[PDB]
Enzyme design. Sequence first.
Site, PDB file in Angstrom:
ATOM      1  N   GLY A  27       0.370  -9.995  10.131  1.00 46.97           N
ATOM      2  CA  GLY A  27      -0.692  -9.629  11.020  1.00 46.97           C
ATOM      3  C   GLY A  27      -2.030  -9.768  10.370  1.00 46.97           C
ATOM      4  O   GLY A  27      -2.104 -10.050   9.218  1.00 46.97           O
ATOM      5  N   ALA A  28      -3.088  -9.544  11.126  1.00 37.90           N
ATOM      6  CA  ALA A  28      -4.434  -9.639  10.618  1.00 37.90           C
ATOM      7  C   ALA A  28      -5.363  -8.636  11.240  1.00 37.90           C
ATOM      8  O   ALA A  28      -5.153  -8.200  12.322  1.00 37.90           O
ATOM      9  CB  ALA A  28      -4.948 -11.010  10.842  1.00 37.90           C
ATOM     10  N   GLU A  57       0.769  -1.221   0.000  1.00 36.40           N
ATOM     11  CA  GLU A  57       0.000   0.000   0.000  1.00 36.40           C
ATOM     12  C   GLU A  57       0.816   1.295   0.000  1.00 36.40           C
ATOM     13  O   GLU A  57       1.866   1.364   0.548  1.00 36.40           O
ATOM     14  CB  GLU A  57      -0.975  -0.065   1.169  1.00 36.40           C
ATOM     15  CG  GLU A  57      -1.641   1.207   1.563  1.00 36.40           C
ATOM     16  CD  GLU A  57      -2.745   1.005   2.541  1.00 36.40           C
ATOM     17  OE1 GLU A  57      -3.371  -0.028   2.514  1.00 36.40           O
ATOM     18  OE2 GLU A  57      -2.999   1.888   3.339  1.00 36.40           O
ATOM     19  N   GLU A  74      -4.663 -16.823   8.526  1.00 42.03           N
ATOM     20  CA  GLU A  74      -4.553 -15.660   7.681  1.00 42.03           C
ATOM     21  C   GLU A  74      -3.168 -15.055   7.747  1.00 42.03           C
ATOM     22  O   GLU A  74      -2.699 -14.542   6.772  1.00 42.03           O
ATOM     23  CB  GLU A  74      -5.618 -14.632   7.991  1.00 42.03           C
ATOM     24  CG  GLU A  74      -5.589 -13.444   7.078  1.00 42.03           C
ATOM     25  CD  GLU A  74      -6.502 -12.314   7.502  1.00 42.03           C
ATOM     26  OE1 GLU A  74      -7.491 -12.568   8.172  1.00 42.03           O
ATOM     27  OE2 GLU A  74      -6.256 -11.164   7.164  1.00 42.03           O
ATOM     28  N   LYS A  83      -0.371 -14.738   4.767  1.00 47.90           N
ATOM     29  CA  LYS A  83       0.344 -13.529   4.509  1.00 47.90           C
ATOM     30  C   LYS A  83       1.832 -13.760   4.513  1.00 47.90           C
ATOM     31  O   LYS A  83       2.552 -13.081   3.829  1.00 47.90           O
ATOM     32  CB  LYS A  83      -0.065 -12.476   5.511  1.00 47.90           C
ATOM     33  CG  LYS A  83      -1.080 -11.556   4.984  1.00 47.90           C
ATOM     34  CD  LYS A  83      -2.105 -11.312   5.959  1.00 47.90           C
ATOM     35  CE  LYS A  83      -2.838 -10.092   5.609  1.00 47.90           C
ATOM     36  NZ  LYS A  83      -3.771  -9.700   6.645  1.00 47.90           N
TER      37      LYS A  83
END
Length: 416
Positions: free
Chosen positions: A386-387, A238, A401, A405
């Site tokens: 992380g999540a 991002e 998750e 990642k």
Amino acid sequence: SSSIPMPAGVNPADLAAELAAVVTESVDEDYLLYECDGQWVLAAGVQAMVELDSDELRVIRDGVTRRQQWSGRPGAALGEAVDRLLLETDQAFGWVAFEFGVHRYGLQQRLAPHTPLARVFSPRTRIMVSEKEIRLFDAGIRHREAIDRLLATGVREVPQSRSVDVSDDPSGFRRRVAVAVDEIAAGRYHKVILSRCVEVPFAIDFPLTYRLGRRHNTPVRSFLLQLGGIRALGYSPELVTAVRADGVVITEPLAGTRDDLESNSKEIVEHAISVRSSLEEITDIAEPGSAAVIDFMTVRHLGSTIRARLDPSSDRMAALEALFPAVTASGIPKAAGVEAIFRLDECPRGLYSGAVVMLSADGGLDAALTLRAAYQVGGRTWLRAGAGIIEESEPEREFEETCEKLSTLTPYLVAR
Ligand SMILES: CC(C)/C=C(\Oc1cccc(C(=O)O)c1O)C(=O)O
């Protein structure tokens, strides 16, 4: 500037990474490689280093350290110092810690002493690699010789990767998710992002690993660095902030991931909230009227792009500060999510969930969100993933998750 066209059949990421390895073998210098819009910029050597810590700012030039007291916003302090660097050189590069985004929510006093907030440097040399050409800024003789050697041989083959087990949960990620969920149930906050660290039990070659991963990832930005005892690589998902010379400010929040995506109410709501959040922050620093969402809830993930024009009372550092930390790596509301991270995540985060930055004398800033990265400090090599946690989340699912990642880097680690 000087230039020397790019040889065909050679990938710019591979070449830039090899150059990072090569210059390292010969000159033993610190560097930061940043990929931005088809340009791989290798910032080679540290002419001047700015270290911003919670208690102090340091400028180190030629082994000489100049310490500074700072008060107020960290952005102002960083900004003032960086602007000075940019009097002597065109660009500056570095990283911003997660902790840069703590003063804003009043949480600074929770930092230990000597807690790093940013490392920004002006380089001795710049080498830019694009599919089209190789550009040299202030390259000396060893650097010229090094490029020549690389061009003469071409890239090393990447050796096969060595696997790591990410199944163990030494930090009780499952327990912490459970705690966060109860607080969410109890109305402390809506969302928080939490992470775990997976130690790599063998040393890795950072430049070889970065090349292997790059083949298999497609990021907004990417980085490879060897800076002050820290080694890191990462393909940032991002863009936290970009400031153009003309004063246009861009931010690109993403709340998508795992048709169904475009219609799923949970994801839609989560996104709308970030976009609204980004807008409010960007609003603080924007020329009145100028702030708009130019791409909304388009699937890319779900992403939107927010635009504004930087207010003349404002500056690039303030814009980064306003938008820091990213929601994607903290939570909603941001102050509560950040506070929860202090309690429930292994701090200080440092590079994780921070930014890697490029700045220009023309007023440019490019800041990329640091996730999907590997680190080496001391003899410690690790990964962090992380999540996002919301009321509905279950720990075992969240753990997987993170596992997903981490598979962005796990298959691609070359030893050495
Ligand atoms: C583009 C990006 C913001 C979106 C995603 O990526 C992440 C978000 C939060 C943490 C991580 C992480 O790796 O630790 C992460 O990869 C997402 O799953 O929503």
